[PDB]
Amino acid sequence: NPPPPETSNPNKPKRQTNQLQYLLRVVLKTLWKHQFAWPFQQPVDAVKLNLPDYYKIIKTPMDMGTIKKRLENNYYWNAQECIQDFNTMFTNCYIYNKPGDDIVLMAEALEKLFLQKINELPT
Ligand SMILES: Cc1cncc(-c2cnc(N[C@@H]3C[C@H]4CC[C@H](N4)[C@H]3CCC3CCC(F)(F)CC3)c3[nH]c(=O)c(C)cc23)c1
């Protein structure tokens, strides 16, 4: 396994915005507690789950645990950085797996919910 993505940098500028608060308090919260969330709550442990090629295929890993930490630590300046990380998580699943796979259908359901919440992103 690689080390997890960076989640904290004290030398980055910090700002609180309505969009970033919403992403943490509404979007991430809602996806976290979704019935199909558990495979996406932490980095893929390719050693433990016997997926030796996962990090040969996925060079930009992302998970909701990392996203939570990034939001909490004010790692993102722009809301789009956070939205991009969610999208990377979904696309990684689509990349590593095949169309119509069970995990892909779970990711598709989370993505659908994500887009419903993003629709209500504050201005
Ligand atoms: C509980 C959990 C935690 N962390 C990660 C995973 C996880 C497992 N397997 C993945 N892929 C595999 C690759 C091949 C082989 C079998 C099948 N095709 C596929 C299994 C999918 C199921 C595994 C058990 C389950 F309960 F989680 C439901 C899905 C994974 N692929 C991924 O892309 C991610 C993000 C996790 C993952 C699961």
From Swiss-Prot:
Effect of residue 97 to A: Abolishes binding to acetylated histones
Tissue: Ubiquitously expressed.
Domain of life: Eukaryota
Segments passing through the bilayer: none
Site (Acetylated histone binding): 97
PTM remark: Phosphorylation by CK2 disrupt the intramolecular binding between the bromo domain 2 and the NPS region and promotes binding between the NPS and the BID regions, leading to activate the protein and promote binding to acetylated histones. In absence of phosphorylation, BRD4 does not localize to p53/TP53 target gene promoters, phosphorylation promoting recruitment to p53/TP53 target promoters.
Domain Bromo stretches: 15-121
Annotated compartments: Nucleus; Chromosome
Site of covalent link Glycyl lysine isopeptide (Lys-Gly) (interchain with G-Cter in SUMO2): 56
Function: Chromatin reader protein that recognizes and binds acetylated histones and plays a key role in transmission of epigenetic memory across cell divisions and transcription regulation. Remains associated with acetylated chromatin throughout the entire cell cycle and provides epigenetic memory for postmitotic G1 gene transcription by preserving acetylated chromatin status and maintaining high-order chromatin structure. During interphase, plays a key role in regulating the transcription of signal-inducible genes by associating with the P-TEFb complex and recruiting it to promoters.
Quaternary structure (record): Interacts with p53/TP53; the interaction is direct. Interacts (via CTD region) with CDK9 and CCNT1, acting as an associated component of P-TEFb complex. Interacts with RELA (when acetylated at 'Lys-310'). Interacts (via NET domain) with NSD3, CHD4, BICRA and ATAD5. The interaction with BICRA bridges BRD4 to the GBAF complex. Interacts (via NET domain) with JMJD6 (via JmjC and N-terminal domains); the interaction is stronger in presence of ssRNA and recruits JMJD6 on distal enhancers. Interacts with NSD3. Interacts with NIPBL.
Domain notes: The NET domain mediates interaction with a number of chromatin proteins involved in transcription regulation (NSD3, JMJD6, CHD4, GLTSCR1 and ATAD5).
Anything else known: JQ1, a thieno-triazolo-1,4-diazepine derivative, and I-BET, a benzodiazepine derivative, have been tested on tumors with success. Treatment with GSK1210151A (I-BET151, a I-BET derivative) has strong effets on mixed lineage leukemia and promotes myeloid differentiation and leukemia stem-cell depletion.
Family indicated by similarity: Belongs to the BET family.
Disorder association: Cornelia de Lange syndrome 6: A form of Cornelia de Lange syndrome, a clinically heterogeneous developmental disorder associated with malformations affecting multiple systems. It is characterized by facial dysmorphisms, abnormal hands and feet, growth delay, cognitive retardation, hirsutism, gastroesophageal dysfunction and cardiac, ophthalmologic and genitourinary anomalies. CDLS6 inheritance is autosomal dominant. A chromosomal aberration involving BRD4 is found in a rare, aggressive, and lethal carcinoma arising in midline organs of young people. Translocation t(15;19)(q14;p13) with NUTM1 which produces a BRD4-NUTM1 fusion protein.
This protein's name: Bromodomain-containing protein 4
Source organism (scientific name): Homo sapiens
Name of the encoding gene: BRD4
